Amino acid sequence: VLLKHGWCEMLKGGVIMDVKSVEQAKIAEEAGAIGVMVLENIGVARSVDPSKVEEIKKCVSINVLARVRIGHFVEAQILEELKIDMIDESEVLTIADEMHHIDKHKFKTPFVCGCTNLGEALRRISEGASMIRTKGEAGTGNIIEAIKHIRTVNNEICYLCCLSDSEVYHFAKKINAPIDLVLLTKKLKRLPVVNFAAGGVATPADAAMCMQLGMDGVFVGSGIFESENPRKMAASIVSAVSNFNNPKILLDVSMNLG
Amino acid sequence: VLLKHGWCEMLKGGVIMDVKSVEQAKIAEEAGAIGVMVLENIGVARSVDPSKVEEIKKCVSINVLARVRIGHFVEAQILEELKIDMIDESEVLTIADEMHHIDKHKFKTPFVCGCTNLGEALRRISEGASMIRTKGEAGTGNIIEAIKHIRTVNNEICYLCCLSDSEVYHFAKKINAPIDLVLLTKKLKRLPVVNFAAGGVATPADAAMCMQLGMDGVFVGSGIFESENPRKMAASIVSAVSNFNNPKILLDVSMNLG
Amino acid sequence: VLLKHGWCEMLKGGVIMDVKSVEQAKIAEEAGAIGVMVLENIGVARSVDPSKVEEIKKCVSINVLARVRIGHFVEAQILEELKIDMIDESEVLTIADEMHHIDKHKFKTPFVCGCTNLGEALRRISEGASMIRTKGEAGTGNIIEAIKHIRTVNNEICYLCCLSDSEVYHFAKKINAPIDLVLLTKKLKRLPVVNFAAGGVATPADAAMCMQLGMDGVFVGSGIFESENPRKMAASIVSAVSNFNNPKILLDVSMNLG
Amino acid sequence: VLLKHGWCEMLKGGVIMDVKSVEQAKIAEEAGAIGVMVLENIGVARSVDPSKVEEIKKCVSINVLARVRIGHFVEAQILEELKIDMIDESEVLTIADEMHHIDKHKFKTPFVCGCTNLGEALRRISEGASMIRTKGEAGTGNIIEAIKHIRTVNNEICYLCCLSDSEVYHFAKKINAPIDLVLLTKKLKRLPVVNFAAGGVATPADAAMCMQLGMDGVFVGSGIFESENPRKMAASIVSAVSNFNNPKILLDVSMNLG
Amino acid sequence: VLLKHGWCEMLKGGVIMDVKSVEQAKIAEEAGAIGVMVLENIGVARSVDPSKVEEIKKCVSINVLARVRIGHFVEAQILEELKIDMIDESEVLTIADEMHHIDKHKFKTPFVCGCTNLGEALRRISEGASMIRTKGEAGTGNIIEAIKHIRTVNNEICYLCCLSDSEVYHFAKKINAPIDLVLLTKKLKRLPVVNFAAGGVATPADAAMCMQLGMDGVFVGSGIFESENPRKMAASIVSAVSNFNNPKILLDVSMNL
Amino acid sequence: ITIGVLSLQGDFEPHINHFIKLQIPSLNIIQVRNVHDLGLCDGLVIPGGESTTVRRCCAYEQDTLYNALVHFIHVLKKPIWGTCAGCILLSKNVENIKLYSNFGNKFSFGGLDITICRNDSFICSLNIIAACIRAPYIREIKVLATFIAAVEQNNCLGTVFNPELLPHTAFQQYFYEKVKNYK
């Protein structure tokens, strides 16, 4: 798992655009993204056809991700055989196993899983997730939930760092997280694994807000390509993440974005 | 912050028209407004594109305001880089942070924030708001809420002024306001910062009623321009606020309004 | 206020019909009405444009009334500057101040206010109303509410007259009315001010029923003019009120009314 | 009624001890009380036998008061024939008429009545009460209720003085008080009639606390005589009220009170 | 108020025993207490008679405290005229004003007030309290509440110091405390005023547990004098607070008790 | 001894408050929004609010107020003071108006033979021979004060700064002395 962490730490400070085809994937590569989440070009949402994921993987030199329903371990086995770069056990797709989550220790391919609090994020890291993202609220464009979750996780980690040795055991029970990771979060003062922001990021300001709140990167939906200029709006989101602390640049990208 | 307060105090007795373009902004400048609030020219409501705000700012010699979602501290950083005249952390736009409000102490640009009672108004002045306005009920044209809130704030301030030194400490807790401001309101006998009226003001009578209830000015929505004569109705509401105590003039401007 | 009372007492036994234009007002004058209530010739209902009220006032020699939202003490000042004959603090229009009622002592123009019980009627007379009317139920044509309120007020006034001086104090508290007026109602055995009937009066029988229950007149809506014969139907309701005790005449006017 | 108020205003700053016999009444006279409320020397509590009140009245040169059940207007007629100095429509005694209150206008003898808020003190003054006292909580010795009521009445009167002229009419309605008195309270800035504190005053500190909160005097129960030294404890509470603003004297009289 | 804080700053690490008479006050003085809280020597509980407080004040060379009902600002005026050392606006006594608290800025005599959370402690310090104590559960001997309150206040202060500048404003609103003090607590990382533990401390172990949780001292009820040896039990709780970090001493004073 | 403040814009309240603070019983201050008030006072101070608002609100009923003020200054020659926007209205020529308004040279009341450019905040020590909240800059042209700071020509006084925003009320008394001298 350490090598998966080493790969993920190389993933910091980037933008992952959820593309739907080769042309969108090529736009997101030239726009400077680090990876592309292959999507279904379209009442049960299932993992995209692996023939689509293979076509994109061979047309872009950047990481390629894919989505598998929560708990559907045989979709993961298919993608793991496809030599994909990172699988995404996603709640956007219909839930296959409402009770369980893929045993991500059995795969060589790193997994990324959602999270809404520190307890949930620590549980998924125990199961084997090599990266986390904030569930937010997909498809709405409202950054209300993403920011709410970013603060909640950030507050809990720091409140933890301010606690005492005998009080950690009760906290772990309260958030319902493994004690070993709870101590690791305290020692590191942050989430043990790379943490990205997902859900609602639609504007260069939204991307920079998330990074100014600590997150290591941004997951960007399909709003980039259902807009007037996809290349420029995509390019704007990337520059915001790279220069999230520079108000002069953030203004520059935000101007004439329509 | 003293210079921000002094600038705002020079802002008393005026009308701020929520314009949507350059022709509307020009109408509101000829009509005699003191400032124009740049709006989105027609879901999630986000801060208007800074290229539009920059367009109006160079076509009118009066103040220009802009709207940023509640808590979105990176839209504000974009606007402050634009050298705007005053930012409005508004609830008409979708809420970015339902739990927090921008830390308005870090910006050189004065902020205006809503308020429905004295406790809420005093909290936002603590955070750094240089002006307040009664939330009312935007988009309805009903002055019921604006008048209800104006009375509520006015009653609380005066009831405070009639209290005693040992009773102030409980009142601050009751309204949940910082004690320092609660005493400052008691000493001044009015809100420590400029106070405007917003939401429902659609007629010269509505504007003058708010001014006759104490407020220092009026925020008038887009109804002025969705009417038969926008220039005449605009100049009417301007004259009503300037001559709110003159029934002869109020009648004159109310006649043949449409 | 005595001069206002004296003028209003001259308004007894008449019909006030709510006209919408000058032709309707001319029909009302020829039909024998004592006054015409100027209406909006059609979200939020506001006081009519004072230019409309001025045009009617100059084309009819009978009293002219107008409606102002409950609590909107600045529409009243506009109308008082217009030299109108009586203002109507109306619940048909949207409520400007849900909590207060215009301070009718500050105006030289007599006011008429709604009422549903003796306590409410006595409170409005305390505020300064020179006439009362039973709210009834506007726009429905059903005289159920008007008759229900007429009986309720009549029963309370007489029940009051049949009490002792020690019990009057609790009664005033129960209905929540000033004690001074409560004693005045007892002494006079009727409401201290002129009382009209409003809401549902649509037929000569309806008008005469209200006058047979002890009112001083009727407020007639716009149903008179949304009918085959506006002049005949109007003169019918006028004759019904003038001859409410004469079944022969009531039959005559009721035949071919539609 | 003015003469009754004139006599009462001469009663300001005094202590009224609820005595039970002639020896207790003699103690309270030498202790410096201004009046003694004759009590029943003990499950229905009735007005004390007038022969007891007659004997005390002849053995003391200070005012003599007596208690009549709430609404019992024939006990009052008995006492008025006795030439008593004040009558107390008491809630300590069983309620003869829970619906009504004696019509105190028909009596030449001034009445004192309880109160827990401004809206209830103003009603009793309308009925004809010449003095008021705060109900408190009789028989418990806890000053919690007396202080709570003193603040409530004091806050409402000042909040009134801080109100506008059109808002007074609604305030009178919500507290349910006659409008004439409400305006009189506003003009005077205090209760129109003498106001005393009753219920819980058992220590020189309790008496002075009530006077430091505005009240014009103190009603002290029978605890003064169920104590080691009745004369000393009595003279202590008398000196506390006379010197309620002198901490040196308050300490002096509080020492060795057992 | 700075002078009051300086005097309280000398009260750290001490034990205040709630005595009822002069012999008890003499025991608590020889036992090493820093102050004695004068009590009523026994259904409304009022402030003790000032002649009793004045008697003890002249028979002990250590601080003397006294109790005034919550809100009774004329009992305090009596005690302040008595030149007492420190007044306690206490909830054990009946509440004179359920709605307000004495305006402690008007007095020269430092006050102490109870507290169950950081918001309540910061409000009382705003009104002018020069010391705080955890309400606990008086009269029961159970340290459950005192320890619960000590942790609650300690957790909130540290969670505060771990927060950010823009989040402090919402926290102040949530706990309902003045923003100025909330920032002061963050800057100092502890309560701005001396903090003692009260309610349930009955054993040398109980006293040392409270001091090991970060308090500056202990308020100890009357349980010491309703016990076989009051002088020995008293000196035990004093040594526990003085040596709260030495298990050898805590064992030694706990034996044969 | 009656001076008025043109209360059709903002900043009139600070001007009134600091005039009253001088604590002279003979001195009385009233708001000025109509011709009746203009004729009531023996002087007038234009608060430093907006310049567009003042001119539009001074053009009600065919320049009824504007004509009253213009005739007031240019005939009665009574003391008048203008701060911030007041100087803009008291200057004969003002430029940097991109919009081609038909007002031309009648937009400004006139009285001071100076050219002003309205088009940001700081504090300057007054080296008289001051909180400048967007103080206009004088381009072309006795100078009462400089740091140019204050210009007094005939009965007209002009200050690009805002004295009423500072505790000291020296300038408020200075205009009162000017009004008394004219009286």
mmCIF file of C-alpha atoms in Angstrom, chain C:
data_model
loop_
_atom_site.group_PDB
_atom_site.id
_atom_site.type_symbol
_atom_site.label_atom_id
_atom_site.label_comp_id
_atom_site.label_asym_id
_atom_site.label_seq_id
_atom_site.Cartn_x
_atom_site.Cartn_y
_atom_site.Cartn_z
ATOM 1 C CA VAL C 1 -63.039 64.111 15.521
ATOM 2 C CA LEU C 2 -66.525 65.440 16.260
ATOM 3 C CA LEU C 3 -66.634 67.219 12.896
ATOM 4 C CA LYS C 4 -65.693 63.934 11.223
ATOM 5 C CA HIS C 5 -68.444 62.201 13.205
ATOM 6 C CA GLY C 6 -70.975 64.845 12.195
ATOM 7 C CA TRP C 7 -70.112 64.491 8.519
ATOM 8 C CA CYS C 8 -70.226 60.695 8.733
ATOM 9 C CA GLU C 9 -73.615 60.748 10.463
ATOM 10 C CA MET C 10 -74.864 62.485 7.310
ATOM 11 C CA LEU C 11 -73.730 59.337 5.452
ATOM 12 C CA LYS C 12 -76.353 57.133 7.131
ATOM 13 C CA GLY C 13 -78.744 55.083 5.032
ATOM 14 C CA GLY C 14 -76.648 55.241 1.863
ATOM 15 C CA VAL C 15 -74.868 52.939 -0.565
ATOM 16 C CA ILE C 16 -71.137 53.114 -1.325
ATOM 17 C CA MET C 17 -70.264 51.080 -4.429
ATOM 18 C CA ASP C 18 -66.669 50.268 -5.368
ATOM 19 C CA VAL C 19 -66.158 51.713 -8.849
ATOM 20 C CA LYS C 20 -63.172 51.103 -11.118
ATOM 21 C CA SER C 21 -63.294 53.980 -13.623
ATOM 22 C CA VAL C 22 -65.117 57.188 -14.517
ATOM 23 C CA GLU C 23 -67.984 55.587 -16.440
ATOM 24 C CA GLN C 24 -68.669 53.297 -13.482
ATOM 25 C CA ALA C 25 -68.456 56.284 -11.142
ATOM 26 C CA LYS C 26 -70.919 58.189 -13.328
ATOM 27 C CA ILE C 27 -73.294 55.210 -13.214
ATOM 28 C CA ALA C 28 -72.931 55.182 -9.431
ATOM 29 C CA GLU C 29 -73.753 58.875 -9.111
ATOM 30 C CA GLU C 30 -76.874 58.592 -11.272
ATOM 31 C CA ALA C 31 -77.945 55.403 -9.464
ATOM 32 C CA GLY C 32 -78.164 57.399 -6.228
ATOM 33 C CA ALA C 33 -75.059 56.236 -4.374
ATOM 34 C CA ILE C 34 -73.691 58.533 -1.688
ATOM 35 C CA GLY C 35 -70.056 57.666 -2.398
ATOM 36 C CA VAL C 36 -67.794 55.735 -4.735
ATOM 37 C CA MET C 37 -64.763 53.757 -3.584
ATOM 38 C CA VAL C 38 -62.094 54.059 -6.263
ATOM 39 C CA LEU C 39 -60.563 50.710 -7.205
ATOM 40 C CA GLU C 40 -57.636 49.395 -9.236
ATOM 41 C CA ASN C 41 -58.719 48.618 -12.813
ATOM 42 C CA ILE C 42 -57.033 45.253 -13.282
ATOM 43 C CA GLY C 43 -49.465 39.423 -6.538
ATOM 44 C CA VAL C 44 -49.333 42.464 -4.256
ATOM 45 C CA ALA C 45 -52.246 44.910 -4.126
ATOM 46 C CA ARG C 46 -51.334 48.539 -3.446
ATOM 47 C CA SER C 47 -53.143 51.847 -3.197
ATOM 48 C CA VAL C 48 -54.359 53.051 -6.577
ATOM 49 C CA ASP C 49 -52.456 55.704 -8.483
ATOM 50 C CA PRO C 50 -53.529 59.085 -7.030
ATOM 51 C CA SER C 51 -54.048 60.323 -10.593
ATOM 52 C CA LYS C 52 -56.915 57.853 -10.972
ATOM 53 C CA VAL C 53 -58.485 58.997 -7.701
ATOM 54 C CA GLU C 54 -58.095 62.620 -8.789
ATOM 55 C CA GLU C 55 -59.810 62.042 -12.139
ATOM 56 C CA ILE C 56 -62.838 60.401 -10.518
ATOM 57 C CA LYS C 57 -62.992 63.021 -7.770
ATOM 58 C CA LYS C 58 -63.373 65.704 -10.446
ATOM 59 C CA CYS C 59 -66.058 63.837 -12.439
ATOM 60 C CA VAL C 60 -68.492 63.052 -9.588
ATOM 61 C CA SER C 61 -70.135 65.335 -7.033
ATOM 62 C CA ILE C 62 -70.515 62.554 -4.454
ATOM 63 C CA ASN C 63 -67.982 61.438 -1.862
ATOM 64 C CA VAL C 64 -64.866 59.668 -3.127
ATOM 65 C CA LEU C 65 -63.076 57.067 -1.021
ATOM 66 C CA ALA C 66 -59.806 55.207 -1.470
ATOM 67 C CA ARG C 67 -58.068 52.189 0.010
ATOM 68 C CA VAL C 68 -54.686 52.102 1.742
ATOM 69 C CA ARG C 69 -52.899 49.015 2.986
ATOM 70 C CA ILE C 70 -53.186 48.216 6.678
ATOM 71 C CA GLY C 71 -50.503 50.214 8.442
ATOM 72 C CA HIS C 72 -49.136 52.044 5.408
ATOM 73 C CA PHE C 73 -49.203 55.498 6.966
ATOM 74 C CA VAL C 74 -47.544 57.111 3.928
ATOM 75 C CA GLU C 75 -50.171 56.190 1.345
ATOM 76 C CA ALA C 76 -52.630 57.920 3.671
ATOM 77 C CA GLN C 77 -50.536 61.100 3.655
ATOM 78 C CA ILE C 78 -50.533 61.012 -0.146
ATOM 79 C CA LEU C 79 -54.328 60.730 -0.209
ATOM 80 C CA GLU C 80 -54.855 63.307 2.530
ATOM 81 C CA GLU C 81 -52.835 65.708 0.388
ATOM 82 C CA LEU C 82 -55.283 64.847 -2.411
ATOM 83 C CA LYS C 83 -58.291 66.155 -0.433
ATOM 84 C CA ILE C 84 -60.144 62.843 -0.659
ATOM 85 C CA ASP C 85 -63.380 62.419 1.310
ATOM 86 C CA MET C 86 -62.627 59.288 3.346
ATOM 87 C CA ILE C 87 -59.788 56.770 3.460
ATOM 88 C CA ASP C 88 -60.241 53.019 3.873
ATOM 89 C CA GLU C 89 -57.640 51.000 5.777
ATOM 90 C CA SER C 90 -58.388 47.862 3.816
ATOM 91 C CA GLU C 91 -57.753 44.172 4.415
ATOM 92 C CA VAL C 92 -58.502 43.493 0.740
ATOM 93 C CA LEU C 93 -55.125 45.033 -0.106
ATOM 94 C CA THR C 94 -51.919 43.391 1.058
ATOM 95 C CA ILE C 95 -50.967 44.176 4.654
ATOM 96 C CA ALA C 96 -48.106 46.675 4.804
ATOM 97 C CA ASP C 97 -47.748 46.452 8.611
ATOM 98 C CA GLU C 98 -48.998 43.161 10.037
ATOM 99 C CA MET C 99 -48.591 44.497 13.574
ATOM 100 C CA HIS C 100 -49.861 48.108 13.591
ATOM 101 C CA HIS C 101 -52.655 50.251 12.190
ATOM 102 C CA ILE C 102 -52.325 53.800 10.896
ATOM 103 C CA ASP C 103 -52.527 56.373 13.681
ATOM 104 C CA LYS C 104 -55.700 57.933 12.349
ATOM 105 C CA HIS C 105 -55.584 60.767 14.896
ATOM 106 C CA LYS C 106 -52.881 62.557 12.884
ATOM 107 C CA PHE C 107 -55.065 62.978 9.776
ATOM 108 C CA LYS C 108 -57.887 65.400 9.063
ATOM 109 C CA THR C 109 -59.463 62.913 6.645
ATOM 110 C CA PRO C 110 -61.913 60.463 8.266
ATOM 111 C CA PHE C 111 -60.983 56.787 8.149
ATOM 112 C CA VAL C 112 -63.133 53.670 7.816
ATOM 113 C CA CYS C 113 -61.816 50.374 9.151
ATOM 114 C CA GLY C 114 -63.019 46.796 9.140
ATOM 115 C CA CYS C 115 -64.263 44.847 12.124
ATOM 116 C CA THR C 116 -65.487 41.371 13.002
ATOM 117 C CA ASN C 117 -66.469 41.806 16.671
ATOM 118 C CA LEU C 118 -67.253 44.575 19.126
ATOM 119 C CA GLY C 119 -63.778 44.429 20.648
ATOM 120 C CA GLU C 120 -62.100 44.979 17.289
ATOM 121 C CA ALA C 121 -64.544 47.748 16.363
ATOM 122 C CA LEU C 122 -63.912 49.533 19.661
ATOM 123 C CA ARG C 123 -60.138 49.286 19.268
ATOM 124 C CA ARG C 124 -60.255 50.879 15.813
ATOM 125 C CA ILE C 125 -62.475 53.669 17.130
ATOM 126 C CA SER C 126 -59.860 54.225 19.829
ATOM 127 C CA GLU C 127 -57.185 54.587 17.149
ATOM 128 C CA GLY C 128 -59.334 57.216 15.433
ATOM 129 C CA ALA C 129 -61.649 55.538 12.930
ATOM 130 C CA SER C 130 -64.716 57.635 12.103
ATOM 131 C CA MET C 131 -66.675 54.746 10.559
ATOM 132 C CA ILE C 132 -66.703 50.958 10.712
ATOM 133 C CA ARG C 133 -67.671 48.180 8.338
ATOM 134 C CA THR C 134 -67.990 44.427 8.749
ATOM 135 C CA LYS C 135 -65.141 42.662 6.957
ATOM 136 C CA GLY C 136 -67.383 39.860 5.746
ATOM 137 C CA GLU C 137 -65.726 37.984 2.885
ATOM 138 C CA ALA C 138 -64.734 40.031 -0.153
ATOM 139 C CA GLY C 139 -64.894 38.605 -3.665
ATOM 140 C CA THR C 140 -67.149 35.645 -2.817
ATOM 141 C CA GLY C 141 -70.636 37.159 -2.932
ATOM 142 C CA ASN C 142 -71.681 35.089 0.092
ATOM 143 C CA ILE C 143 -73.417 37.192 2.740
ATOM 144 C CA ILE C 144 -72.799 34.475 5.329
ATOM 145 C CA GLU C 145 -69.866 36.259 6.959
ATOM 146 C CA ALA C 146 -71.391 39.738 6.811
ATOM 147 C CA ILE C 147 -74.559 38.495 8.511
ATOM 148 C CA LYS C 148 -72.546 36.467 11.016
ATOM 149 C CA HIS C 149 -70.494 39.519 11.982
ATOM 150 C CA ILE C 150 -73.516 41.834 12.100
ATOM 151 C CA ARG C 151 -75.220 39.527 14.592
ATOM 152 C CA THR C 152 -72.056 39.043 16.646
ATOM 153 C CA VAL C 153 -71.531 42.787 17.058
ATOM 154 C CA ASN C 154 -75.228 43.398 17.735
ATOM 155 C CA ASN C 155 -75.439 40.629 20.334
ATOM 156 C CA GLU C 156 -72.338 41.831 22.183
ATOM 157 C CA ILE C 157 -73.534 45.436 22.308
ATOM 158 C CA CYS C 158 -76.896 44.432 23.774
ATOM 159 C CA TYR C 159 -75.430 41.807 26.112
ATOM 160 C CA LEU C 160 -73.182 44.625 27.295
ATOM 161 C CA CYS C 161 -76.205 46.867 27.846
ATOM 162 C CA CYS C 162 -77.781 44.159 30.022
ATOM 163 C CA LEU C 163 -74.847 44.055 32.504
ATOM 164 C CA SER C 164 -73.888 45.823 35.735
ATOM 165 C CA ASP C 165 -71.230 48.427 36.411
ATOM 166 C CA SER C 166 -68.965 45.937 38.195
ATOM 167 C CA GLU C 167 -69.105 43.398 35.353
ATOM 168 C CA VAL C 168 -68.246 45.960 32.669
ATOM 169 C CA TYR C 169 -64.592 45.984 33.710
ATOM 170 C CA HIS C 170 -64.104 42.274 33.061
ATOM 171 C CA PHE C 171 -66.061 42.446 29.805
ATOM 172 C CA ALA C 172 -63.759 45.165 28.482
ATOM 173 C CA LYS C 173 -60.822 42.908 29.318
ATOM 174 C CA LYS C 174 -62.433 39.863 27.701
ATOM 175 C CA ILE C 175 -63.155 41.600 24.384
ATOM 176 C CA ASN C 176 -59.920 43.583 24.848
ATOM 177 C CA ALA C 177 -61.347 47.058 24.328
ATOM 178 C CA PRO C 178 -60.781 50.429 26.004
ATOM 179 C CA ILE C 179 -62.992 50.821 29.049
ATOM 180 C CA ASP C 180 -63.981 54.368 28.087
ATOM 181 C CA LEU C 181 -65.543 53.268 24.799
ATOM 182 C CA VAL C 182 -67.117 50.170 26.362
ATOM 183 C CA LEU C 183 -69.058 52.458 28.691
ATOM 184 C CA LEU C 184 -69.908 54.736 25.758
ATOM 185 C CA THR C 185 -71.336 51.807 23.798
ATOM 186 C CA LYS C 186 -73.403 50.875 26.855
ATOM 187 C CA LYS C 187 -74.735 54.418 27.225
ATOM 188 C CA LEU C 188 -75.637 54.803 23.542
ATOM 189 C CA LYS C 189 -76.739 51.147 23.186
ATOM 190 C CA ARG C 190 -75.066 51.028 19.747
ATOM 191 C CA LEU C 191 -71.650 51.455 18.176
ATOM 192 C CA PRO C 192 -70.342 54.975 18.917
ATOM 193 C CA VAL C 193 -69.640 55.605 15.205
ATOM 194 C CA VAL C 194 -71.479 55.043 11.940
ATOM 195 C CA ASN C 195 -71.524 51.374 10.977
ATOM 196 C CA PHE C 196 -71.844 50.033 7.434
ATOM 197 C CA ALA C 197 -72.126 46.516 6.030
ATOM 198 C CA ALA C 198 -69.536 45.232 3.573
ATOM 199 C CA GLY C 199 -68.829 41.957 1.828
ATOM 200 C CA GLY C 200 -71.377 39.782 0.062
ATOM 201 C CA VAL C 201 -74.065 42.401 -0.571
ATOM 202 C CA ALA C 202 -74.961 41.566 -4.179
ATOM 203 C CA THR C 203 -78.780 41.576 -4.406
ATOM 204 C CA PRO C 204 -81.490 44.018 -3.305
ATOM 205 C CA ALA C 205 -82.547 41.376 -0.782
ATOM 206 C CA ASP C 206 -79.007 41.168 0.597
ATOM 207 C CA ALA C 207 -78.809 44.941 1.002
ATOM 208 C CA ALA C 208 -82.181 45.145 2.751
ATOM 209 C CA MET C 209 -81.381 42.219 5.042
ATOM 210 C CA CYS C 210 -78.290 44.031 6.314
ATOM 211 C CA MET C 211 -80.266 47.227 6.869
ATOM 212 C CA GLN C 212 -83.009 45.250 8.629
ATOM 213 C CA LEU C 213 -80.374 43.963 11.072
ATOM 214 C CA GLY C 214 -79.571 47.514 12.148
ATOM 215 C CA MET C 215 -76.794 48.867 9.933
ATOM 216 C CA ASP C 216 -76.560 52.403 8.570
ATOM 217 C CA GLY C 217 -75.723 51.478 4.980
ATOM 218 C CA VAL C 218 -74.003 49.011 2.701
ATOM 219 C CA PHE C 219 -70.692 48.777 0.873
ATOM 220 C CA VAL C 220 -71.359 47.178 -2.519
ATOM 221 C CA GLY C 221 -68.580 45.513 -4.496
ATOM 222 C CA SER C 222 -68.047 45.417 -8.247
ATOM 223 C CA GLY C 223 -70.719 42.803 -8.963
ATOM 224 C CA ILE C 224 -73.120 45.590 -9.920
ATOM 225 C CA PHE C 225 -71.179 46.271 -13.122
ATOM 226 C CA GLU C 226 -70.364 42.659 -14.067
ATOM 227 C CA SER C 227 -74.046 42.125 -14.813
ATOM 228 C CA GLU C 228 -76.462 42.576 -17.696
ATOM 229 C CA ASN C 229 -77.856 45.921 -16.496
ATOM 230 C CA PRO C 230 -75.435 47.926 -14.327
ATOM 231 C CA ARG C 231 -77.637 51.013 -14.016
ATOM 232 C CA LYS C 232 -80.785 49.048 -13.187
ATOM 233 C CA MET C 233 -79.040 46.675 -10.789
ATOM 234 C CA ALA C 234 -77.385 49.669 -9.115
ATOM 235 C CA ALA C 235 -80.607 51.634 -8.653
ATOM 236 C CA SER C 236 -82.158 48.428 -7.316
ATOM 237 C CA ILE C 237 -79.663 48.135 -4.461
ATOM 238 C CA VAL C 238 -80.059 51.854 -3.764
ATOM 239 C CA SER C 239 -83.849 51.561 -3.535
ATOM 240 C CA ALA C 240 -83.563 48.451 -1.372
ATOM 241 C CA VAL C 241 -81.521 50.353 1.211
ATOM 242 C CA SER C 242 -83.815 53.380 1.047
ATOM 243 C CA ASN C 243 -86.919 51.179 1.414
ATOM 244 C CA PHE C 244 -85.575 48.185 3.336
ATOM 245 C CA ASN C 245 -88.807 47.886 5.371
ATOM 246 C CA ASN C 246 -91.157 47.817 2.350
ATOM 247 C CA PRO C 247 -91.621 44.292 0.950
ATOM 248 C CA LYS C 248 -93.671 45.658 -1.946
ATOM 249 C CA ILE C 249 -90.754 47.741 -3.221
ATOM 250 C CA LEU C 250 -88.209 45.005 -2.516
ATOM 251 C CA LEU C 251 -90.217 42.698 -4.766
ATOM 252 C CA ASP C 252 -90.437 45.370 -7.463
ATOM 253 C CA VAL C 253 -86.681 45.935 -7.671
ATOM 254 C CA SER C 254 -85.917 42.199 -7.508
ATOM 255 C CA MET C 255 -88.000 41.375 -10.605
ATOM 256 C CA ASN C 256 -85.967 41.223 -13.833
ATOM 257 C CA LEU C 257 -82.865 42.240 -11.867
ATOM 258 C CA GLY C 258 -80.739 39.859 -13.946
#
